[PDB]
PDB file of all heavy atoms in Angstrom:
ATOM      1  N   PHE D   1     -42.441  37.605  44.810  1.00 49.08           N
ATOM      2  CA  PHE D   1     -43.578  36.876  44.257  1.00 49.08           C
ATOM      3  C   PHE D   1     -43.382  36.448  42.804  1.00 49.08           C
ATOM      4  O   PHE D   1     -44.096  35.550  42.341  1.00 49.08           O
ATOM      5  CB  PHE D   1     -44.873  37.669  44.408  1.00 49.08           C
ATOM      6  CG  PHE D   1     -45.682  37.253  45.598  1.00 49.08           C
ATOM      7  CD1 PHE D   1     -45.430  37.790  46.848  1.00 49.08           C
ATOM      8  CD2 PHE D   1     -46.673  36.294  45.466  1.00 49.08           C
ATOM      9  CE1 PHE D   1     -46.174  37.390  47.953  1.00 49.08           C
ATOM     10  CE2 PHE D   1     -47.417  35.888  46.563  1.00 49.08           C
ATOM     11  CZ  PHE D   1     -47.165  36.438  47.806  1.00 49.08           C
ATOM     12  N   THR D   2     -42.442  37.057  42.074  1.00 47.54           N
ATOM     13  CA  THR D   2     -42.121  36.531  40.750  1.00 47.54           C
ATOM     14  C   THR D   2     -41.583  35.108  40.837  1.00 47.54           C
ATOM     15  O   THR D   2     -41.730  34.330  39.887  1.00 47.54           O
ATOM     16  CB  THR D   2     -41.136  37.445  40.016  1.00 47.54           C
ATOM     17  OG1 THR D   2     -39.861  37.414  40.672  1.00 47.54           O
ATOM     18  CG2 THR D   2     -41.668  38.870  39.957  1.00 47.54           C
ATOM     19  N   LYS D   3     -40.985  34.743  41.973  1.00 46.63           N
ATOM     20  CA  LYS D   3     -40.530  33.377  42.193  1.00 46.63           C
ATOM     21  C   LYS D   3     -41.595  32.484  42.810  1.00 46.63           C
ATOM     22  O   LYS D   3     -41.503  31.257  42.688  1.00 46.63           O
ATOM     23  CB  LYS D   3     -39.241  33.341  43.022  1.00 46.63           C
ATOM     24  CG  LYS D   3     -38.070  34.022  42.333  1.00 46.63           C
ATOM     25  CD  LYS D   3     -36.775  33.821  43.093  1.00 46.63           C
ATOM     26  CE  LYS D   3     -35.586  34.231  42.233  1.00 46.63           C
ATOM     27  NZ  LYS D   3     -34.296  34.037  42.948  1.00 46.63           N
ATOM     28  N   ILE D   4     -42.589  33.067  43.469  1.00 48.80           N
ATOM     29  CA  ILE D   4     -43.663  32.266  44.035  1.00 48.80           C
ATOM     30  C   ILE D   4     -44.657  31.889  42.945  1.00 48.80           C
ATOM     31  O   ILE D   4     -45.174  30.766  42.922  1.00 48.80           O
ATOM     32  CB  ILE D   4     -44.320  33.024  45.202  1.00 48.80           C
ATOM     33  CG1 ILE D   4     -43.311  33.196  46.343  1.00 48.80           C
ATOM     34  CG2 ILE D   4     -45.579  32.306  45.664  1.00 48.80           C
ATOM     35  CD1 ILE D   4     -43.681  34.277  47.346  1.00 48.80           C
ATOM     36  N   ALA D   5     -44.957  32.825  42.045  1.00 51.50           N
ATOM     37  CA  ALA D   5     -45.845  32.524  40.934  1.00 51.50           C
ATOM     38  C   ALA D   5     -45.270  31.344  40.156  1.00 51.50           C
ATOM     39  O   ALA D   5     -44.053  31.168  40.063  1.00 51.50           O
ATOM     40  CB  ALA D   5     -45.989  33.744  40.026  1.00 51.50           C
ATOM     41  N   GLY D   6     -46.148  30.518  39.609  1.00 48.41           N
ATOM     42  CA  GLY D   6     -45.674  29.322  38.951  1.00 48.41           C
ATOM     43  C   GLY D   6     -45.374  28.180  39.895  1.00 48.41           C
ATOM     44  O   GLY D   6     -45.025  27.090  39.427  1.00 48.41           O
ATOM     45  N   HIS D   7     -45.471  28.402  41.209  1.00 48.88           N
ATOM     46  CA  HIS D   7     -45.386  27.343  42.206  1.00 48.88           C
ATOM     47  C   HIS D   7     -46.595  27.408  43.130  1.00 48.88           C
ATOM     48  O   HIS D   7     -46.512  26.984  44.286  1.00 48.88           O
ATOM     49  CB  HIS D   7     -44.108  27.422  43.043  1.00 48.88           C
ATOM     50  CG  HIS D   7     -42.845  27.255  42.257  1.00 48.88           C
ATOM     51  ND1 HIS D   7     -42.435  26.038  41.759  1.00 48.88           N
ATOM     52  CD2 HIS D   7     -41.882  28.145  41.919  1.00 48.88           C
ATOM     53  CE1 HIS D   7     -41.285  26.189  41.126  1.00 48.88           C
ATOM     54  NE2 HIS D   7     -40.927  27.458  41.211  1.00 48.88           N
ATOM     55  N   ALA D   8     -47.718  27.932  42.633  1.00 45.82           N
ATOM     56  CA  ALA D   8     -48.856  28.233  43.503  1.00 45.82           C
ATOM     57  C   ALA D   8     -49.373  26.977  44.182  1.00 45.82           C
ATOM     58  O   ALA D   8     -49.573  26.952  45.403  1.00 45.82           O
ATOM     59  CB  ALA D   8     -49.974  28.912  42.709  1.00 45.82           C
ATOM     60  N   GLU D   9     -49.589  25.916  43.412  1.00 43.54           N
ATOM     61  CA  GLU D   9     -50.090  24.686  44.007  1.00 43.54           C
ATOM     62  C   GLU D   9     -49.082  24.093  44.987  1.00 43.54           C
ATOM     63  O   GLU D   9     -49.442  23.730  46.114  1.00 43.54           O
ATOM     64  CB  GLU D   9     -50.458  23.678  42.918  1.00 43.54           C
ATOM     65  CG  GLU D   9     -51.118  22.435  43.476  1.00 43.54           C
ATOM     66  CD  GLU D   9     -51.500  21.439  42.397  1.00 43.54           C
ATOM     67  OE1 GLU D   9     -51.860  21.873  41.282  1.00 43.54           O
ATOM     68  OE2 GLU D   9     -51.445  20.220  42.669  1.00 43.54           O
ATOM     69  N   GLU D  10     -47.807  24.003  44.588  1.00 44.87           N
ATOM     70  CA  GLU D  10     -46.805  23.380  45.445  1.00 44.87           C
ATOM     71  C   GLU D  10     -46.638  24.157  46.743  1.00 44.87           C
ATOM     72  O   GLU D  10     -46.667  23.573  47.834  1.00 44.87           O
ATOM     73  CB  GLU D  10     -45.457  23.278  44.726  1.00 44.87           C
ATOM     74  CG  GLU D  10     -44.377  22.585  45.569  1.00 44.87           C
ATOM     75  CD  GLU D  10     -42.954  22.881  45.111  1.00 44.87           C
ATOM     76  OE1 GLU D  10     -42.781  23.467  44.019  1.00 44.87           O
ATOM     77  OE2 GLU D  10     -42.006  22.526  45.849  1.00 44.87           O
ATOM     78  N   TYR D  11     -46.467  25.481  46.641  1.00 45.21           N
ATOM     79  CA  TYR D  11     -46.207  26.277  47.840  1.00 45.21           C
ATOM     80  C   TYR D  11     -47.464  26.397  48.701  1.00 45.21           C
ATOM     81  O   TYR D  11     -47.379  26.375  49.935  1.00 45.21           O
ATOM     82  CB  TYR D  11     -45.660  27.661  47.469  1.00 45.21           C
ATOM     83  CG  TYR D  11     -44.254  27.669  46.873  1.00 45.21           C
ATOM     84  CD1 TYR D  11     -43.668  28.867  46.475  1.00 45.21           C
ATOM     85  CD2 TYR D  11     -43.520  26.499  46.724  1.00 45.21           C
ATOM     86  CE1 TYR D  11     -42.375  28.901  45.927  1.00 45.21           C
ATOM     87  CE2 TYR D  11     -42.219  26.522  46.170  1.00 45.21           C
ATOM     88  CZ  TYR D  11     -41.668  27.732  45.772  1.00 45.21           C
ATOM     89  OH  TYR D  11     -40.395  27.783  45.224  1.00 45.21           O
ATOM     90  N   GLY D  12     -48.641  26.501  48.078  1.00 44.68           N
ATOM     91  CA  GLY D  12     -49.880  26.556  48.858  1.00 44.68           C
ATOM     92  C   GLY D  12     -50.152  25.266  49.610  1.00 44.68           C
ATOM     93  O   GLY D  12     -50.532  25.278  50.797  1.00 44.68           O
ATOM     94  N   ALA D  13     -49.975  24.131  48.930  1.00 45.77           N
ATOM     95  CA  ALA D  13     -50.137  22.847  49.593  1.00 45.77           C
ATOM     96  C   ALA D  13     -49.170  22.704  50.763  1.00 45.77           C
ATOM     97  O   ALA D  13     -49.565  22.258  51.848  1.00 45.77           O
ATOM     98  CB  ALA D  13     -49.949  21.715  48.576  1.00 45.77           C
ATOM     99  N   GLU D  14     -47.906  23.114  50.589  1.00 44.92           N
ATOM    100  CA  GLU D  14     -46.946  22.983  51.678  1.00 44.92           C
ATOM    101  C   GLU D  14     -47.280  23.928  52.829  1.00 44.92           C
ATOM    102  O   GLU D  14     -47.090  23.582  54.004  1.00 44.92           O
ATOM    103  CB  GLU D  14     -45.530  23.252  51.172  1.00 44.92           C
ATOM    104  CG  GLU D  14     -44.486  22.882  52.191  1.00 44.92           C
ATOM    105  CD  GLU D  14     -43.069  23.131  51.703  1.00 44.92           C
ATOM    106  OE1 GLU D  14     -42.865  23.273  50.471  1.00 44.92           O
ATOM    107  OE2 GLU D  14     -42.160  23.195  52.558  1.00 44.92           O
ATOM    108  N   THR D  15     -47.726  25.145  52.514  1.00 45.93           N
ATOM    109  CA  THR D  15     -48.127  26.079  53.567  1.00 45.93           C
ATOM    110  C   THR D  15     -49.246  25.492  54.423  1.00 45.93           C
ATOM    111  O   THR D  15     -49.169  25.516  55.660  1.00 45.93           O
ATOM    112  CB  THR D  15     -48.558  27.414  52.964  1.00 45.93           C
ATOM    113  OG1 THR D  15     -47.452  27.978  52.258  1.00 45.93           O
ATOM    114  CG2 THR D  15     -49.013  28.389  54.046  1.00 45.93           C
ATOM    115  N   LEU D  16     -50.272  24.933  53.777  1.00 48.18           N
ATOM    116  CA  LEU D  16     -51.390  24.343  54.514  1.00 48.18           C
ATOM    117  C   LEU D  16     -50.952  23.122  55.322  1.00 48.18           C
ATOM    118  O   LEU D  16     -51.325  22.989  56.493  1.00 48.18           O
ATOM    119  CB  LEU D  16     -52.508  23.971  53.548  1.00 48.18           C
ATOM    120  CG  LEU D  16     -53.292  25.108  52.908  1.00 48.18           C
ATOM    121  CD1 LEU D  16     -54.180  24.514  51.812  1.00 48.18           C
ATOM    122  CD2 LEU D  16     -54.136  25.898  53.913  1.00 48.18           C
ATOM    123  N   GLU D  17     -50.158  22.223  54.726  1.00 49.31           N
ATOM    124  CA  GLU D  17     -49.678  21.060  55.461  1.00 49.31           C
ATOM    125  C   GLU D  17     -48.855  21.486  56.668  1.00 49.31           C
ATOM    126  O   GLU D  17     -48.990  20.917  57.756  1.00 49.31           O
ATOM    127  CB  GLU D  17     -48.888  20.144  54.524  1.00 49.31           C
ATOM    128  CG  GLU D  17     -49.794  19.530  53.468  1.00 49.31           C
ATOM    129  CD  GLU D  17     -49.103  18.492  52.603  1.00 49.31           C
ATOM    130  OE1 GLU D  17     -47.992  18.053  52.964  1.00 49.31           O
ATOM    131  OE2 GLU D  17     -49.722  18.043  51.613  1.00 49.31           O
ATOM    132  N   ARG D  18     -48.027  22.521  56.510  1.00 45.15           N
ATOM    133  CA  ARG D  18     -47.274  23.019  57.649  1.00 45.15           C
ATOM    134  C   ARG D  18     -48.192  23.588  58.712  1.00 45.15           C
ATOM    135  O   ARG D  18     -47.964  23.377  59.908  1.00 45.15           O
ATOM    136  CB  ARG D  18     -46.216  24.030  57.207  1.00 45.15           C
ATOM    137  CG  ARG D  18     -45.010  23.337  56.626  1.00 45.15           C
ATOM    138  CD  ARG D  18     -43.980  24.284  56.006  1.00 45.15           C
ATOM    139  NE  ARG D  18     -42.905  23.468  55.442  1.00 45.15           N
ATOM    140  CZ  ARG D  18     -41.908  22.917  56.134  1.00 45.15           C
ATOM    141  NH1 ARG D  18     -41.780  23.114  57.445  1.00 45.15           N
ATOM    142  NH2 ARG D  18     -41.022  22.154  55.500  1.00 45.15           N
ATOM    143  N   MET D  19     -49.232  24.312  58.313  1.00 48.15           N
ATOM    144  CA  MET D  19     -50.118  24.893  59.318  1.00 48.15           C
ATOM    145  C   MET D  19     -50.860  23.804  60.088  1.00 48.15           C
ATOM    146  O   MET D  19     -50.940  23.855  61.321  1.00 48.15           O
ATOM    147  CB  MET D  19     -51.095  25.870  58.664  1.00 48.15           C
ATOM    148  CG  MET D  19     -51.945  26.654  59.686  1.00 48.15           C
ATOM    149  SD  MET D  19     -53.234  27.649  58.897  1.00 48.15           S
ATOM    150  CE  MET D  19     -54.220  26.371  58.103  1.00 48.15           C
ATOM    151  N   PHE D  20     -51.373  22.796  59.383  1.00 47.13           N
ATOM    152  CA  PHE D  20     -52.108  21.727  60.064  1.00 47.13           C
ATOM    153  C   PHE D  20     -51.217  20.915  61.008  1.00 47.13           C
ATOM    154  O   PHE D  20     -51.685  20.454  62.056  1.00 47.13           O
ATOM    155  CB  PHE D  20     -52.761  20.812  59.025  1.00 47.13           C
ATOM    156  CG  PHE D  20     -53.793  21.489  58.152  1.00 47.13           C
ATOM    157  CD1 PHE D  20     -53.907  21.145  56.808  1.00 47.13           C
ATOM    158  CD2 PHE D  20     -54.659  22.451  58.657  1.00 47.13           C
ATOM    159  CE1 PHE D  20     -54.850  21.741  55.991  1.00 47.13           C
ATOM    160  CE2 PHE D  20     -55.613  23.056  57.838  1.00 47.13           C
ATOM    161  CZ  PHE D  20     -55.711  22.699  56.496  1.00 47.13           C
ATOM    162  N   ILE D  21     -49.939  20.719  60.664  1.00 48.74           N
ATOM    163  CA  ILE D  21     -49.035  19.939  61.505  1.00 48.74           C
ATOM    164  C   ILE D  21     -48.485  20.777  62.646  1.00 48.74           C
ATOM    165  O   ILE D  21     -48.389  20.304  63.784  1.00 48.74           O
ATOM    166  CB  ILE D  21     -47.918  19.314  60.647  1.00 48.74           C
ATOM    167  CG1 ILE D  21     -48.534  18.437  59.556  1.00 48.74           C
ATOM    168  CG2 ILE D  21     -46.937  18.526  61.510  1.00 48.74           C
ATOM    169  CD1 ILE D  21     -47.534  17.875  58.575  1.00 48.74           C
ATOM    170  N   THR D  22     -48.125  22.039  62.374  1.00 47.64           N
ATOM    171  CA  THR D  22     -47.531  22.882  63.409  1.00 47.64           C
ATOM    172  C   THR D  22     -48.594  23.403  64.366  1.00 47.64           C
ATOM    173  O   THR D  22     -48.331  23.571  65.566  1.00 47.64           O
ATOM    174  CB  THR D  22     -46.793  24.063  62.766  1.00 47.64           C
ATOM    175  OG1 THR D  22     -45.781  23.561  61.885  1.00 47.64           O
ATOM    176  CG2 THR D  22     -46.088  24.911  63.829  1.00 47.64           C
ATOM    177  N   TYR D  23     -49.786  23.690  63.853  1.00 48.96           N
ATOM    178  CA  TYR D  23     -50.870  24.265  64.657  1.00 48.96           C
ATOM    179  C   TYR D  23     -52.130  23.422  64.455  1.00 48.96           C
ATOM    180  O   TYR D  23     -53.064  23.816  63.742  1.00 48.96           O
ATOM    181  CB  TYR D  23     -51.112  25.729  64.295  1.00 48.96           C
ATOM    182  CG  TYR D  23     -49.872  26.614  64.268  1.00 48.96           C
ATOM    183  CD1 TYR D  23     -49.299  26.994  63.056  1.00 48.96           C
ATOM    184  CD2 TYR D  23     -49.307  27.101  65.435  1.00 48.96           C
ATOM    185  CE1 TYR D  23     -48.167  27.812  63.015  1.00 48.96           C
ATOM    186  CE2 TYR D  23     -48.183  27.915  65.407  1.00 48.96           C
ATOM    187  CZ  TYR D  23     -47.627  28.273  64.193  1.00 48.96           C
ATOM    188  OH  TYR D  23     -46.514  29.090  64.146  1.00 48.96           O
ATOM    189  N   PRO D  24     -52.190  22.248  65.077  1.00 48.36           N
ATOM    190  CA  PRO D  24     -53.283  21.295  64.789  1.00 48.36           C
ATOM    191  C   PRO D  24     -54.685  21.862  64.990  1.00 48.36           C
ATOM    192  O   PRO D  24     -55.612  21.421  64.297  1.00 48.36           O
ATOM    193  CB  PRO D  24     -52.993  20.130  65.748  1.00 48.36           C
ATOM    194  CG  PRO D  24     -51.493  20.154  65.880  1.00 48.36           C
ATOM    195  CD  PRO D  24     -51.128  21.640  65.897  1.00 48.36           C
ATOM    196  N   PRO D  25     -54.919  22.818  65.904  1.00 45.91           N
ATOM    197  CA  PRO D  25     -56.286  23.374  65.997  1.00 45.91           C
ATOM    198  C   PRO D  25     -56.824  23.989  64.713  1.00 45.91           C
ATOM    199  O   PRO D  25     -58.046  24.060  64.547  1.00 45.91           O
ATOM    200  CB  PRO D  25     -56.194  24.403  67.133  1.00 45.91           C
ATOM    201  CG  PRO D  25     -55.119  23.891  67.986  1.00 45.91           C
ATOM    202  CD  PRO D  25     -54.110  23.246  67.065  1.00 45.91           C
ATOM    203  N   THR D  26     -55.965  24.439  63.790  1.00 43.76           N
ATOM    204  CA  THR D  26     -56.455  25.018  62.552  1.00 43.76           C
ATOM    205  C   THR D  26     -57.205  23.999  61.705  1.00 43.76           C
ATOM    206  O   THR D  26     -57.977  24.398  60.827  1.00 43.76           O
ATOM    207  CB  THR D  26     -55.289  25.619  61.734  1.00 43.76           C
ATOM    208  OG1 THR D  26     -54.323  24.602  61.413  1.00 43.76           O
ATOM    209  CG2 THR D  26     -54.606  26.762  62.490  1.00 43.76           C
ATOM    210  N   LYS D  27     -57.019  22.698  61.982  1.00 41.40           N
ATOM    211  CA  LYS D  27     -57.746  21.675  61.238  1.00 41.40           C
ATOM    212  C   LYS D  27     -59.251  21.769  61.461  1.00 41.40           C
ATOM    213  O   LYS D  27     -60.021  21.280  60.624  1.00 41.40           O
ATOM    214  CB  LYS D  27     -57.230  20.275  61.607  1.00 41.40           C
ATOM    215  CG  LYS D  27     -55.789  20.008  61.172  1.00 41.40           C
ATOM    216  CD  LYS D  27     -55.376  18.572  61.434  1.00 41.40           C
ATOM    217  CE  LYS D  27     -55.246  18.294  62.920  1.00 41.40           C
ATOM    218  NZ  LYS D  27     -54.692  16.928  63.160  1.00 41.40           N
ATOM    219  N   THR D  28     -59.674  22.415  62.561  1.00 43.37           N
ATOM    220  CA  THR D  28     -61.098  22.544  62.880  1.00 43.37           C
ATOM    221  C   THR D  28     -61.884  23.231  61.769  1.00 43.37           C
ATOM    222  O   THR D  28     -63.088  22.984  61.615  1.00 43.37           O
ATOM    223  CB  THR D  28     -61.286  23.289  64.213  1.00 43.37           C
ATOM    224  OG1 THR D  28     -62.645  23.146  64.657  1.00 43.37           O
ATOM    225  CG2 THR D  28     -60.992  24.781  64.069  1.00 43.37           C
ATOM    226  N   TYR D  29     -61.236  24.096  60.986  1.00 43.61           N
ATOM    227  CA  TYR D  29     -61.933  24.842  59.956  1.00 43.61           C
ATOM    228  C   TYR D  29     -62.142  24.023  58.701  1.00 43.61           C
ATOM    229  O   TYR D  29     -62.871  24.459  57.815  1.00 43.61           O
ATOM    230  CB  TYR D  29     -61.172  26.133  59.612  1.00 43.61           C
ATOM    231  CG  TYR D  29     -61.205  27.134  60.749  1.00 43.61           C
ATOM    232  CD1 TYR D  29     -60.175  27.206  61.652  1.00 43.61           C
ATOM    233  CD2 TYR D  29     -62.277  27.993  60.894  1.00 43.61           C
ATOM    234  CE1 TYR D  29     -60.200  28.102  62.691  1.00 43.61           C
ATOM    235  CE2 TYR D  29     -62.311  28.903  61.937  1.00 43.61           C
ATOM    236  CZ  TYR D  29     -61.277  28.935  62.829  1.00 43.61           C
ATOM    237  OH  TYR D  29     -61.303  29.852  63.863  1.00 43.61           O
ATOM    238  N   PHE D  30     -61.546  22.836  58.637  1.00 43.24           N
ATOM    239  CA  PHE D  30     -61.626  22.042  57.421  1.00 43.24           C
ATOM    240  C   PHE D  30     -62.183  20.649  57.699  1.00 43.24           C
ATOM    241  O   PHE D  30     -61.606  19.649  57.243  1.00 43.24           O
ATOM    242  CB  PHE D  30     -60.239  21.931  56.775  1.00 43.24           C
ATOM    243  CG  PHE D  30     -59.692  23.244  56.309  1.00 43.24           C
ATOM    244  CD1 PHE D  30     -58.993  24.076  57.181  1.00 43.24           C
ATOM    245  CD2 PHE D  30     -59.878  23.649  54.996  1.00 43.24           C
ATOM    246  CE1 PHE D  30     -58.487  25.302  56.723  1.00 43.24           C
ATOM    247  CE2 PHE D  30     -59.374  24.859  54.544  1.00 43.24           C
ATOM    248  CZ  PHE D  30     -58.680  25.684  55.411  1.00 43.24           C
ATOM    249  N   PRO D  31     -63.304  20.536  58.417  1.00 44.93           N
ATOM    250  CA  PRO D  31     -63.823  19.197  58.723  1.00 44.93           C
ATOM    251  C   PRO D  31     -64.231  18.439  57.490  1.00 44.93           C
ATOM    252  O   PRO D  31     -64.299  17.206  57.537  1.00 44.93           O
ATOM    253  CB  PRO D  31     -65.046  19.502  59.594  1.00 44.93           C
ATOM    254  CG  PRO D  31     -65.549  20.795  59.073  1.00 44.93           C
ATOM    255  CD  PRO D  31     -64.275  21.584  58.783  1.00 44.93           C
ATOM    256  N   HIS D  32     -64.529  19.138  56.401  1.00 42.42           N
ATOM    257  CA  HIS D  32     -64.970  18.550  55.137  1.00 42.42           C
ATOM    258  C   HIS D  32     -63.823  18.059  54.261  1.00 42.42           C
ATOM    259  O   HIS D  32     -64.081  17.454  53.206  1.00 42.42           O
ATOM    260  CB  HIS D  32     -65.851  19.535  54.365  1.00 42.42           C
ATOM    261  CG  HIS D  32     -65.228  20.888  54.132  1.00 42.42           C
ATOM    262  ND1 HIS D  32     -64.708  21.663  55.153  1.00 42.42           N
ATOM    263  CD2 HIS D  32     -65.083  21.613  53.000  1.00 42.42           C
ATOM    264  CE1 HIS D  32     -64.249  22.797  54.651  1.00 42.42           C
ATOM    265  NE2 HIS D  32     -64.475  22.796  53.350  1.00 42.42           N
ATOM    266  N   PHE D  33     -62.580  18.302  54.657  1.00 41.15           N
ATOM    267  CA  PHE D  33     -61.421  17.932  53.857  1.00 41.15           C
ATOM    268  C   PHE D  33     -60.839  16.594  54.295  1.00 41.15           C
ATOM    269  O   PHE D  33     -60.830  16.250  55.481  1.00 41.15           O
ATOM    270  CB  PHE D  33     -60.303  18.963  54.051  1.00 41.15           C
ATOM    271  CG  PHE D  33     -60.347  20.136  53.119  1.00 41.15           C
ATOM    272  CD1 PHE D  33     -61.523  20.589  52.535  1.00 41.15           C
ATOM    273  CD2 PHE D  33     -59.156  20.802  52.820  1.00 41.15           C
ATOM    274  CE1 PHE D  33     -61.509  21.689  51.687  1.00 41.15           C
ATOM    275  CE2 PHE D  33     -59.147  21.894  51.981  1.00 41.15           C
ATOM    276  CZ  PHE D  33     -60.304  22.331  51.400  1.00 41.15           C
ATOM    277  N   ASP D  34     -60.290  15.865  53.320  1.00 38.27           N
ATOM    278  CA  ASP D  34     -59.255  14.881  53.598  1.00 38.27           C
ATOM    279  C   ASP D  34     -57.968  15.651  53.871  1.00 38.27           C
ATOM    280  O   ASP D  34     -57.461  16.341  52.982  1.00 38.27           O
ATOM    281  CB  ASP D  34     -59.079  13.975  52.375  1.00 38.27           C
ATOM    282  CG  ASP D  34     -57.905  12.997  52.508  1.00 38.27           C
ATOM    283  OD1 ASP D  34     -57.322  12.857  53.596  1.00 38.27           O
ATOM    284  OD2 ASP D  34     -57.576  12.337  51.501  1.00 38.27           O
ATOM    285  N   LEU D  35     -57.442  15.536  55.091  1.00 36.85           N
ATOM    286  CA  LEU D  35     -56.275  16.303  55.504  1.00 36.85           C
ATOM    287  C   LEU D  35     -54.979  15.493  55.502  1.00 36.85           C
ATOM    288  O   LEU D  35     -53.983  15.933  56.091  1.00 36.85           O
ATOM    289  CB  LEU D  35     -56.508  16.955  56.866  1.00 36.85           C
ATOM    290  CG  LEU D  35     -57.606  18.015  56.845  1.00 36.85           C
ATOM    291  CD1 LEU D  35     -57.852  18.549  58.249  1.00 36.85           C
ATOM    292  CD2 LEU D  35     -57.236  19.125  55.885  1.00 36.85           C
ATOM    293  N   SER D  36     -54.961  14.333  54.850  1.00 36.54           N
ATOM    294  CA  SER D  36     -53.719  13.581  54.741  1.00 36.54           C
ATOM    295  C   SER D  36     -52.792  14.234  53.717  1.00 36.54           C
ATOM    296  O   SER D  36     -53.221  15.016  52.864  1.00 36.54           O
ATOM    297  CB  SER D  36     -53.994  12.126  54.358  1.00 36.54           C
ATOM    298  OG  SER D  36     -54.674  12.049  53.120  1.00 36.54           O
ATOM    299  N   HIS D  37     -51.501  13.910  53.821  1.00 38.66           N
ATOM    300  CA  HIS D  37     -50.485  14.570  53.006  1.00 38.66           C
ATOM    301  C   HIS D  37     -50.790  14.429  51.520  1.00 38.66           C
ATOM    302  O   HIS D  37     -51.067  13.332  51.028  1.00 38.66           O
ATOM    303  CB  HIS D  37     -49.108  13.971  53.303  1.00 38.66           C
ATOM    304  CG  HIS D  37     -48.029  14.442  52.373  1.00 38.66           C
ATOM    305  ND1 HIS D  37     -47.272  15.568  52.618  1.00 38.66           N
ATOM    306  CD2 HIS D  37     -47.589  13.943  51.192  1.00 38.66           C
ATOM    307  CE1 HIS D  37     -46.409  15.738  51.632  1.00 38.66           C
ATOM    308  NE2 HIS D  37     -46.580  14.768  50.753  1.00 38.66           N
ATOM    309  N   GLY D  38     -50.745  15.553  50.807  1.00 39.21           N
ATOM    310  CA  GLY D  38     -50.916  15.524  49.369  1.00 39.21           C
ATOM    311  C   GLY D  38     -52.306  15.181  48.891  1.00 39.21           C
ATOM    312  O   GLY D  38     -52.479  14.862  47.711  1.00 39.21           O
TER     313      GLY D  38
END
């Protein structure tokens, strides 16, 4: 986590984008979001 810290936004955004693309049903929890890349 010393290497993850300082990349919180980048790594968190990529984790979420991967989850929405790999497991599309998870998008159901974010109907209020714009879910396009970035």
Side-chain angles (χ1 to χ4, degrees):
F1 262 85
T2 68
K3 297 187 167 180
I4 295 162
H7 297 286
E9 186 179 326
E10 182 200 350
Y11 291 179
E14 191 180 342
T15 299
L16 289 170
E17 293 186 13
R18 282 173 182 280
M19 187 187 62
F20 297 143
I21 302 175
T22 301
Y23 310 104
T26 60
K27 294 186 290 186
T28 193
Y29 291 95
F30 296 86
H32 54 307
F33 272 26
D34 174 10
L35 294 176
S36 59
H37 171 89

